[PDB]
Amino acid sequence: MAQNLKDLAGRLPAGPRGMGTALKLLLGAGAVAYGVRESVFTVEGGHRAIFFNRIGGVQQDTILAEGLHFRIPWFQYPIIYDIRARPRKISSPTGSKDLQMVNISLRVLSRPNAQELPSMYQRLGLDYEERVLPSIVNEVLKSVVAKFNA
Amino acid sequence: MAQNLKDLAGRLPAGPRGMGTALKLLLGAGAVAYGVRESVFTVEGGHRAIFFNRIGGVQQDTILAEGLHFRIPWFQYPIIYDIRARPRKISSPTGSKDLQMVNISLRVLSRPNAQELPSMYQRLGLDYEERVLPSIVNEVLKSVVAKFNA
Amino acid sequence: MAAKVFESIGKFGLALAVAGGVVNSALYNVDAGHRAVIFDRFRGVQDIVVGEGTHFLIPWVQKPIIFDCRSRPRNVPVITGSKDLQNVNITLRILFRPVASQLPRIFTSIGEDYDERVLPSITTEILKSVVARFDA
């Protein structure tokens, strides 16, 4: 495979001095274009992306309104955080006051923040709501239904 | 096979006097490089090494911080001694005071010391922690639980 | 004269590209809520937490230790024996997070995955401690 590439490279005509410099400039322009391309998270309508990074520390200042906001590769990892709502529902079998097994459902509408995207995105994970809601709902229902009769 | 090697060696051109000395110098440099190479253990991140020793006993004094420390070849195989933590878990069924069988678990977090690595590794081998934890854990559990009813 | 100028331009461009590559490899922005730390052998991960600004790494020492210093909830179930000795299943949610400053030490001893080594042990031992003293 490498032999074919070498032969093709050699077969390129040895044009005047200007053509090589033009090719070098074109390659540089393409690289710069790719670098600039990555550099703004096109977070979908009604979404956000705080910066995602690793930076020997992490500064929670540059928090970033809809769409157009300023990333870089491995400097700003984005992930398109949906500040638009995402709902939830959780149930609970409680030993009620009469010790009757009370199965109560509970639809929790927890949404993600924009200028405090951090705690969400990384350590709560992209799956923040899943990590958060289930057993808090369970505690709620069991505590309050052990407090309430049928 | 040897005949082919002899023919290849003979086929090497008999050039001026200088390239022979140059080849000798290159061979010596390569040998020195390999000798240096074997002599610095890359005891992995967070690990350690004593001088695993083949002379003068195993001097239990020249112990080696993580990473940047030096093995002698054929006098120093610093197999990678993991001073980092490797957890453990040990259980025990005991006859409680009422002669009732009771299962008791106990997860231990035991680590080796860096500046007593010499006998830790020599004496207690690479697998110090496995050679150590179980019997003490079981002695403790049974001696304390035979005392403790169920 | 033109050929020399073109050669110098190409050499300068190559040098600029190399310098930019090095700078980018050492650099990475301000998210919120990690605090990575210089991962150095001589001292072990540098005792200093590397500050929350866009605070860098020098090459190859700080394998980005993504000290995700934000918060995570962790649910530990315990099948605890109550006073009447009824096997009660109790699931405890512990919200938790690491400490900014001592992320160096945290990696020298444990590593990036500090959290999972701890929460289950304390939580199980302690829910047992508690609900053992308590009835079904």
UniProtKB/Swiss-Prot annotation, chains A, B:
Task: Name a GO molecular-function annotation.
Answer: sphingolipid binding
Summary of the tissues where the protein is detected: Expressed in myoblasts.
Location of Phosphotyrosine modifications: 128
Q: Which residues of the full protein are shown?
A: 1 to 150 of 299
GO biological process terms, alphabetically, are: antiviral innate immune response; B cell activation; cell migration; estrogen receptor signaling pathway; mammary gland alveolus development; mammary gland branching involved in thelarche; mammary gland epithelial cell proliferation; mitochondrion organization
Q: How does it assemble?
A: The mitochondrial prohibitin complex consists of two subunits (PHB1 and PHB2), assembled into a membrane-associated ring-shaped supercomplex of approximately 1 mDa. Interacts with ESR1, HDAC1 and HDAC5. Interacts with ZNF703. Interacts with STOML2. Interacts with ARFGEF3. Interacts with SPHK2. Interacts with COX4I1; the interaction associates PHB2 with COX. Interacts with MAP1LC3B (membrane-bound form LC3-II); the interaction is direct and upon mitochondrial depolarization and proteasome-dependent outer membrane rupture. Interacts with IGFBP6 (via C-terminal domain). Interacts with CLPB.
Q: Is Cytoplasm given among the entry's keywords?
A: yes
UniProt modification remark: Phosphorylated. Tyrosine phosphorylation is indirectly stimulated by IGFBP6.
Q: Which UniProt keywords apply?
A: Acetylation, Cell membrane, Coiled coil, Cytoplasm, Host-virus interaction, Membrane, Mitochondrion, Mitochondrion inner membrane, Nucleus, Phosphoprotein, Receptor, Repressor, Transcription, Transcription regulation
Copy the domain comment.
LC3-interaction region (LIR) is required for interaction with MAP1LC3B/LC3-II and for Parkin-mediated mitophagy.
The answer to keyword Repressor applying to this record is yes
The segment annotated LC3-interaction region runs over: 121-124
Q: Return the annotated region ranges for Necessary for transcriptional repression.
A: 19-49
For this chain, the family text in UniProt reads: Belongs to the prohibitin family.
Q: Tell what triggers its expression.
A: Expression increases approximately 3-fold upon entry into G1 phase compared to other phases of the cell cycle. Also induced following inhibition of mitochondrial protein synthesis by thiamphenicol.
Q: What protein does this entry describe? A: Prohibitin-2
The protein's superkingdom reads Eukaryota
Cell compartment(s), UniProt: Mitochondrion inner membrane; Cytoplasm; Nucleus; Cell membrane
From Swiss-Prot, chain C:
Q: Which residues cross the membrane?
A: none
Tissue specificity, per the record, is: Widely expressed in different tissues.
User: N-acetylalanine occurs at which residues?
Assistant: 2
Tell me a Gene Ontology molecular-function term this record carries: complement component C3a binding
Highest taxon, organism lineage: Eukaryota
Phenotypic consequence of residue 105 to H: In a breast cancer sample; somatic mutation
Q: Name one GO biological process term.
A: protein stabilization
Phosphothreonine modification, residue list: 91
- Write the protein's name: Prohibitin 1
The gene name on file is: PHB1
